[PDB]
Write a protein that holds these residues in place. Structure first.
Motif, mmCIF file in Angstrom:
data_model
loop_
_atom_site.group_PDB
_atom_site.id
_atom_site.type_symbol
_atom_site.label_atom_id
_atom_site.label_comp_id
_atom_site.label_asym_id
_atom_site.label_seq_id
_atom_site.Cartn_x
_atom_site.Cartn_y
_atom_site.Cartn_z
ATOM 1 N N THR A 178 -15.492 -36.136 21.218
ATOM 2 C CA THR A 178 -16.392 -35.698 20.167
ATOM 3 C C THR A 178 -15.734 -34.558 19.411
ATOM 4 O O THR A 178 -15.784 -34.534 18.181
ATOM 5 N N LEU A 179 -14.984 -33.718 20.123
ATOM 6 C CA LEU A 179 -14.601 -32.408 19.645
ATOM 7 C C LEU A 179 -13.101 -32.179 19.843
ATOM 8 O O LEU A 179 -12.563 -32.319 20.943
ATOM 9 N N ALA A 212 -15.864 -26.589 16.811
ATOM 10 C CA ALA A 212 -16.408 -27.801 17.389
ATOM 11 C C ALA A 212 -15.955 -29.098 16.772
ATOM 12 O O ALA A 212 -15.075 -29.148 15.919
ATOM 13 N N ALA A 213 -16.584 -30.160 17.250
ATOM 14 C CA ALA A 213 -16.446 -31.490 16.696
ATOM 15 C C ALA A 213 -16.780 -31.523 15.232
ATOM 16 O O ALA A 213 -16.376 -32.448 14.531
ATOM 17 N N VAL A 239 -24.512 -29.010 21.431
ATOM 18 C CA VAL A 239 -23.251 -29.198 20.711
ATOM 19 C C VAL A 239 -22.672 -30.593 20.966
ATOM 20 O O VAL A 239 -21.715 -30.984 20.291
ATOM 21 N N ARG A 240 -23.210 -31.375 21.923
ATOM 22 C CA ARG A 240 -22.740 -32.752 21.931
ATOM 23 C C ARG A 240 -23.306 -33.499 20.786
ATOM 24 O O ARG A 240 -22.712 -34.487 20.373
ATOM 25 N N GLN A 241 -24.392 -33.035 20.200
ATOM 26 C CA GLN A 241 -24.669 -33.544 18.875
ATOM 27 C C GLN A 241 -23.482 -33.247 17.949
ATOM 28 O O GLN A 241 -23.137 -34.066 17.082
ATOM 29 N N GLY A 242 -22.790 -32.140 18.198
ATOM 30 C CA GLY A 242 -21.511 -31.870 17.581
ATOM 31 C C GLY A 242 -21.266 -30.443 17.110
ATOM 32 O O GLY A 242 -20.113 -30.104 16.859
ATOM 33 N N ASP A 249 -24.545 -26.624 30.561
ATOM 34 C CA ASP A 249 -24.891 -28.001 30.235
ATOM 35 C C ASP A 249 -25.516 -28.098 28.837
ATOM 36 O O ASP A 249 -25.431 -29.143 28.189
ATOM 37 N N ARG A 293 -23.573 -27.459 25.764
ATOM 38 C CA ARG A 293 -23.042 -28.751 25.269
ATOM 39 C C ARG A 293 -24.186 -29.718 24.954
ATOM 40 O O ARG A 293 -23.923 -30.682 24.219
ATOM 41 N N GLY A 294 -25.403 -29.500 25.476
ATOM 42 C CA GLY A 294 -26.401 -30.513 25.161
ATOM 43 C C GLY A 294 -27.038 -30.398 23.782
ATOM 44 O O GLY A 294 -27.859 -31.244 23.401
ATOM 45 N N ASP A 315 -12.722 -32.568 23.832
ATOM 46 C CA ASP A 315 -12.780 -33.974 24.194
ATOM 47 C C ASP A 315 -13.345 -34.764 23.026
ATOM 48 O O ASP A 315 -13.831 -34.157 22.070
#
Length: 148
Positions: free
Chosen positions: A99-100, A16-17, A77-80, A71, A74-75, A97
């Motif tokens: 972030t990552l 991940a990011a 893992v968009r924290q990262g 969703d 990623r919701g 993308d």
DNA sequence: TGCATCCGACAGAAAAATTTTCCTGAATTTTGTATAAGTAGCTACAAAATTCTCGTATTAATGCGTTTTTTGCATAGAGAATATGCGTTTTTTGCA
């Protein structure tokens, strides 16, 4: 039935990011539980295979908490960070993308016994594949499947 | 003029009186007699109809030899199914 698996890509996972499996670039499957590896659906064959694919590298499939929604994959893992199941063929696409930018890898897959990778499987009846559309294309799609 | 006492069987004879019944006007349970009008029907007559019948004309009905056709016919392929099969696997036995 005409059992027909076009190919069986070998499984990896989401780094991940910030993953430290995006540090630890491979993916055995301990390296999963190392961060929060939530397993997918108990009952759904998809995981029956992954049960291997996380269950023979210092780990046993831990279907703790999976929201059953990409969703959400990623919701949190968009924290990262958060990490769960994205298999090989689209694990060309784990690093994406801004972030990552992620650590790719191949399969650790000690889980195999006989033949065991998850298999893209177009399986059919002549009636079903008795026309240019599916028959030839369905064949071509099970054929023109590059890493791209 | 004031204190007690008391009351509020039977018989005969003539006249009346209720019904009964035949005679006598009164005008009805009504219903009777001829003439002239009028109300309703019968005989006759009108015909162009309409419609009944015979003949002809078109048309729709009905049978067939054959168009294609649907449905029953056979024998050819495939796709696993089903062995051998090791080869791998699960079963079964004795020591600590």
């Amino acid at each position: 039935m005409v059992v027909e698996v076009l190919y069986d890509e070998p499984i990896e996972l989401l780094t991940a990011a910030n993953h430290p499996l995006a540090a630890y670039e491979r993916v055995p499957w301990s390296e999963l539980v190392r961060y929060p590896q939530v397993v997918f659906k108990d009952g759904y064959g998809m995981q029956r295979l992954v049960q291997e694919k996380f269950e023979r590298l210092e780990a046993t499939l831990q279907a703790a908490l999976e929201v059953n929604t990409l969703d959400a994959f990623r919701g949190v893992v968009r924290q990262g960070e958060l990490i769960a199941l994205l298999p090989s063929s689209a694990l060309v696409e784990a690093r994406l993308d801004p972030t990552l930018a992620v650590r790719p890898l191949a399969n650790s897959a000690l889980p195999e016994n006989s033949g065991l990778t998850r298999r893209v499987v177009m399986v059919t009846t002549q009636d079903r594949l008795q026309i240019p559309p599916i028959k030839h294309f369905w064949q071509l799609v099970r054929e023109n499947i590059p890493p791209i």
